[PDB]
Design a protein around this motif. Sequence first.
Motif, PDB file in Angstrom:
ATOM      1  N   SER A 214      -3.491  -8.269  84.568  1.00 20.88           N
ATOM      2  CA  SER A 214      -2.357  -7.892  85.398  1.00 20.88           C
ATOM      3  C   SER A 214      -2.872  -7.397  86.739  1.00 20.88           C
ATOM      4  N   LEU A 215      -2.330  -7.954  87.821  1.00 23.26           N
ATOM      5  CA  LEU A 215      -2.695  -7.577  89.182  1.00 23.26           C
ATOM      6  C   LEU A 215      -1.418  -7.343  89.974  1.00 23.26           C
ATOM      7  N   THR A 216      -1.188  -6.099  90.393  1.00 23.94           N
ATOM      8  CA  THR A 216       0.024  -5.757  91.127  1.00 23.94           C
ATOM      9  C   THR A 216      -0.321  -4.931  92.359  1.00 23.94           C
ATOM     10  N   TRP A 217       0.632  -4.863  93.287  1.00 23.31           N
ATOM     11  CA  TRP A 217       0.506  -4.073  94.504  1.00 23.31           C
ATOM     12  C   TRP A 217       1.575  -2.987  94.523  1.00 23.31           C
ATOM     13  N   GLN A 218       1.243  -1.879  95.147  1.00 24.63           N
ATOM     14  CA  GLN A 218       2.099  -0.732  95.257  1.00 24.63           C
ATOM     15  C   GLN A 218       2.095  -0.033  96.609  1.00 24.63           C
ATOM     16  N   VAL A 261      -4.938  -2.927  88.652  1.00 25.13           N
ATOM     17  CA  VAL A 261      -5.528  -3.943  87.791  1.00 25.13           C
ATOM     18  C   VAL A 261      -5.459  -3.450  86.353  1.00 25.13           C
ATOM     19  N   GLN A 262      -5.098  -4.349  85.440  1.00 27.47           N
ATOM     20  CA  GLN A 262      -5.037  -4.024  84.022  1.00 27.47           C
ATOM     21  C   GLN A 262      -5.659  -5.156  83.220  1.00 27.47           C
ATOM     22  N   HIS A 263      -6.590  -4.804  82.337  1.00 27.58           N
ATOM     23  CA  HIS A 263      -7.361  -5.781  81.583  1.00 27.58           C
ATOM     24  C   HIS A 263      -7.973  -5.085  80.377  1.00 27.58           C
ATOM     25  N   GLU A 264      -8.053  -5.806  79.256  1.00 25.27           N
ATOM     26  CA  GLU A 264      -8.576  -5.208  78.033  1.00 25.27           C
ATOM     27  C   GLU A 264     -10.056  -4.865  78.144  1.00 25.27           C
TER      28      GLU A 264
END
Lengths: 275, 97, 12
Positions: A214-218, A261-264
């Motif tokens: 998961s790749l997001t901007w804020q 960033v979210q990753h196992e």
Amino acid sequence: GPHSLSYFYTAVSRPDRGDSRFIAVGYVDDTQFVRFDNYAPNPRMEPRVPWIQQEGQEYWDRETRNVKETAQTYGVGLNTLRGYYNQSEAGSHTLQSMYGCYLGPDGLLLHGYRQDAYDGADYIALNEDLRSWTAADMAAQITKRKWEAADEAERRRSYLQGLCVESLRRYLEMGKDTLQRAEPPKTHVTRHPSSDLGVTLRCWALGFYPKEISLTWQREGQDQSQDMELVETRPSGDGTFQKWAALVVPPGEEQSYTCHVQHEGLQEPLTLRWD
Amino acid sequence: ARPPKVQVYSRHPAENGKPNYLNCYVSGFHPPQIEIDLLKNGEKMNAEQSDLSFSKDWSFYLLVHTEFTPNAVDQYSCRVKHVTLDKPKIVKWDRDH
Amino acid sequence: RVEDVTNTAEYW
């Protein structure tokens, strides 16, 4: 998450001389380890990663036999569904299958699946209980009644409960050094001043495994900045994957945006910025 | 008829005059018939094609990869032809995208 | 020892 072993089958009917092109790929999670193609001269099941080459020739003989028989079966299934859909012999049509098993905590089948599509849309899927079928249209109901009468669900269950999970365990032991460690993404944010009073920031995550990420901007608000140029996750070419998310922010407020960033491969969500 | 999405990229961050790996990843297309060529200044590079697979939505994906060594002059691209494209789709390699 | 035996058809 739990490890997985899956198999993908693509069968293509040819107008030209009545047969069919059958291609099979095997995955241990997101790593391809075998392949097969009956376009080849005297086709065989072939290794596609080093570790699977620890299997002897008896394994390769067997696998080759099984996939050849499966190829003949998909060749006849192409004609069957062509008859179901009242289509001629002039056109080329595709029959796809994906099946597999996830490895549970007790060393047994966590869950399994087996899905088939005709011309790129759902045809028939095996339900979660592995004892029933979901037919996607009217033609698939014929297939489903056939399969309930002769209990193909039990064949799928016997495979996914025995052979699939045992082979997946043996594989995860064989490819211990590559298959079982999830490498986290190496991340960094680049800046490209281009548009008028507009500056692009791109958050890169490179060289991670498995592929889900998961790749997001804020910015100052709560939602993901849907100022997001996000590309599809892509193979690096060496077994890992990469991805990036870009957006355009005014020249003054680069530090008002953060990439999440979210990753196992990471125990916690990662946060970074243009430094 | 679902159109392919084409990405041209290096495995590692591009540095001039250093070995690297060029990739053309083509995704989301159906039927599986497709032509994919990597091009160095318009000439076909000798590259390997992955085995045909597909995603959960049944759309296919392929990877055409080879070695390369980027500089500041050589232009790299990927030419992709599929029944859904009237003209061939050429995507140029950009070290920043 | 991986593959499923899909002759379980003539069925589809």
